[PDB]
Amino acid sequence: MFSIRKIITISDYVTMLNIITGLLAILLNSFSLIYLSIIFDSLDGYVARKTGTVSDFGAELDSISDVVSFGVAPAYLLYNNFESNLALISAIIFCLCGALRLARFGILNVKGFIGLPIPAGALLLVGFCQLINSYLINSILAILIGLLMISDIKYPKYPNKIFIYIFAVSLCLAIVGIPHFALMLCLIYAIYGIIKYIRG
Template sequence: MRIFKLITVSDYVTILNAVSGILAILLNNYHFIYLAVIFDALDGYVARKTQTVSEFGKELDSLADVISFSIAPAYFFYLKHGLILLPIIYSICGMLRLARFNIIKTNNFIGLPIPAAALCMITLISISDYTVLNSLFLLLVSFLMISDFEYKKYFKNEIIILILISLILAIMNFPYLLMILLIIYIISPIIELL
C-alpha cells in the first residue's frame, strides 16, 4: 500500500502520541496523556533531526493531538464532574486551535498550545475536586487556546530538562511542580505585556 511510503520515522513517534491518548481513554488512566506529551515533543525533534518534516506528518500530528489533548482531557473532566457542555467547549476550542496552527506560520505559538492546555486540565483534575474551580480553569484554557496571545515555541535546554523532570514526577503522582510551571507559562504573555 502506498500510504506506508508516506510514513517516516517521526510519524511513528506521532502514532505513539495517538496510541497514548487512546490508551488513556480505554484504560481510564490519565497518566498516558503525560506520555502523549513526551511523544508529541519528540516527533518534531525526530523530524528535524532526520529531515523528514512533511505535510503528511503535520496533518497526522494534528489528528493525534485531537485524540490525546482534546478528546482525552474532555473525557476525564466529564468523568470527574459529570458535566457535558464544558468538555465539549474545551474540545472544540482545541480543534480550532489546531486548525489555526496548521495555516499560520509564526516564530511563536498563537494561542495556548493544546498540549499545555491538556496538561493544565489533567494536572488540575488530579489535585482538585472542586467543580467550580476546575470548570473556571477549563473555560480559561479554552479561551487561551483560541486567543491571540503569543506563547514561546522554544525553550532553553535547562527549562526543557525541568519540564521533563516535572512530567516524570507527574507520572509518579506528584504533579505540583508541573502545575507551577504550567501556571507560569499560561500567564507569561501577560507578564511580557506588563
C-alpha cells in the same frame, strides 16, 4: 496494495505511539497517559528535525494526535471523572476551543503560538482535575483555559534540548502521580504570556 508505507517515516512511528497513549488515556481513564503524550508531542518534532524526516503527512499526523490526546482526552477525562450537567457543558467548550486552536495552527506555521497551546492547555486542565476534586472549580477552569487557548496572547515556542528536558522530568514526575512541578511550570508559562502581551 498499501502505499502510505512509502511515506511513513521514523518520526511518524513516534506520533503513532503518541496517538495510542492519547487514545489509551480515554479508554483506560488515566490522567497519567496524557503526561506521557505531552512528552511524545515534544519529541516527535525534535526527532523529525534530528532525523531529517519533516513531512507534511507527519505534520498533519502531529496535529491529529494533538486533537486526540490534548483535545478529546482532557474533555472526556473532565466529564467522566466529574459527571455533571455543567461539566458536560465545560468539556465541550474546552475540546472545541482546542479544535479551533489547532485549525488556526494548521494555517499558520512553526513561528510560535497564537494563544495558549493545546499541549499546555491540556496539561493545565488534566493536572487541575488530579489535584482539585470539585465539579465546579475544574469546570470553570476549563472555560478559562479554553478562552486562553483561542486567545490572541502570543506564546513563544523554543524547543531547546534543555528546555524540552526540564519539561520532561517535570512530566515524568507527573507520570508517577506527582504533577505539581508540571502544574507550576506551565502556569508560570501561562502567566509569562499575559504579562508579555500587555507589554514586553
